[PDB]
Amino acid sequence: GSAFCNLARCELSCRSLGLLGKCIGEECKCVPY
Numbered sequence: 001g002s003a004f005c006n007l008a009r010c011e012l013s014c015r016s017l018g019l020l021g022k023c024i025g026e027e028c029k030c031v032p033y
Helices: 007-014
Strands: 020-024 027-031
Touching: 007 020, 007 027
Parallel strands: none
Antiparallel strands: 020 027
16 A cells, blocks of 8 residues: 555564564564464
């Protein structure tokens, strides 16, 4: 919509904090595997 999450880019971003990436509501949100 006005934003668009990318799972590959969210996965590479959540990898920088030590956890898994997912998209929720067209935003990036990280999760504990």
